[PDB]
A paper describes a structure:
The spindle assembly abnormal protein 6 ([name]-6) self-assembles into 9-fold radially symmetric ring-shaped oligomers that stack via an unknown mechanism to form the cartwheel. [name]-6 proteins comprise a globular “head” domain at their N-terminus followed by a long coiled coil that mediates stable protein homo-dimerization (Keller et al., 2014), and a disordered C-terminal extension. The characteristic shape of the [name]-6 ring led to the proposal that the protein head domains comprise the central “hub” of the centriolar cartwheel, with [name]-6 coiled coils forming the cartwheel “spokes” (Cottee et al., 2015; Kitagawa et al., 2011; van Breugel et al., 2011; van Breugel et al., 2014; Yoshiba et al., 2019).
In contrast, structures of the [name]_CCMiddle fragment, resolved from two different crystal forms, revealed parallel complexes featuring extensive interaction interfaces between coiled-coil domains, within each crystal’s asymmetric unit. [name]_CCMiddle form II, resolved to 2.43 Å using one copy of the [name]_CCMiddle coiled coil from form I as molecular replacement model, featured four copies of the coiled-coil domain per asymmetric unit. Of these, two copies were arranged in a symmetric-interacting fashion identical to the form I complex. In striking contrast, the remaining two [name] coiled-coil copies formed a parallel but distinctly asymmetric complex driven by hydrogen-bonding and ionic interactions, which buried ∼1,700 Å2 of solvent-accessible surface. The contact interface of the asymmetric [name] coiled-coil complex overlapped to a great extent with that of the symmetric complex, but also involved additional amino acid residues; a comparison of amino acids at the two interfaces is shown in Figure S2B. Although CrSAS-6VD did form cartwheels, they were less abundant and less apparent compared with those formed by the WT protein, suggesting reduced stacking propensity.
Residue numbers in the entry:
A (entry chain F): 9 to 114
B (entry chain E): 7 to 113
C (entry chain A): 8 to 114
D (entry chain D): 3 to 113
The structure:
């Protein structure tokens, strides 16, 4: 019975020593988990803000691109209208000079 | 009898200690697993944030350049509207002089 | 013999008890996690319903705005046309007037 | 055999205490497994709602952004329509004035 008491005390000591270490580790892990869970929540807030800014910038860039192309088209049409109006001027000048020449003959 | 009660007391206390150990080992494994899942979500969100922040800078840069083009086209459009208004006015004056000479030639 | 059975039972009892306290410990944390998850779920449900509602209202507004834009574009082209034609009538009256002025001058 | 009765009672007492403990353990394991299941279901719903919410929130921002840009176009077009109405009103008025001046010149030329 004396040998049994010794064997059990011995097994209990080993088990309890292991237990105190495991209780420390559970406490350590619960703490790290709380910290990671907080960082995760924080990164989610920051990501949502950054993703929001991307969408706003995407819409601005797409709208700006449309404006540029609309203005490009309008500039082309204006260049054409100006070239044609100046050409009508030049033609009127020549027709006037020709009518003056016709009239001179008398 | 007093020695028999000690063995029974130690056996019971050993069983309780072992049961606590079996449980603590399971909980440590449960917590370690959760920790690497949380650690992975954190690392993932960091990658995604860095990419989103990068995309914002690229879009800010593009939006600023596009904004410059828009205003330099607006300025050019204004100058073209002006040139056209003035040229059309010179045309209209030439048309009046030509129409007048046509009328004089007719009579 | 019977004393070894007593030792065997006491050890098994302690282990069973220890396991039981571990489950009591577990149930409690599970009840807590459940309450937290249930609350996040309720919150997300509210937010989703609101966001889905806002999507419908924005889709409706975007579609109506698109109609206006196209109606205005159609009206702009009809006004451009009317202006082009009216200016052409002007130019023709301006030529007729300049012609009459020239005819009067020679007489 | 008086000691055997005292030892026999212990075995009996401990056996019944073990069975009862073993039984309580099976009930507690059912509650842990009932709660673990509900937790998994709730955790899954949460993850699902987060995906859906992120998508819906994204769509809201894109639509808000589009509606603001469309509103700018509408107002730019309204301004341009007003300027065109004015140009047209003025051109038609110049026409009417040229018609009157022409009719006058025709009348003077006749006399």
């Amino acid at each position: 019975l004396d040998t049994k008491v010794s064997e059990l005390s011995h097994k209990l000591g080993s088990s309890e020593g292991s237990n105190r270490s495991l209780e420390e580790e559970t406490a350590r892990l619960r703490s790290l988990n709380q910290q990671l869970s907080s960082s995760k929540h924080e990164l989610e807030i920051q990501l949502n803000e950054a993703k929001a800014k991307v969408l706003a910038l995407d819409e601005k860039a797409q709208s700006q691109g449309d404006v540029i192309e609309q203005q490009r088209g309008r500039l082309r049409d204006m260049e054409a209208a100006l070239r044609q109006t100046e050409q009508r001027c030049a033609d009127l000048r020549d027709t006037l000079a020709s009518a003056e020449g016709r009239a001179k003959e008398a």
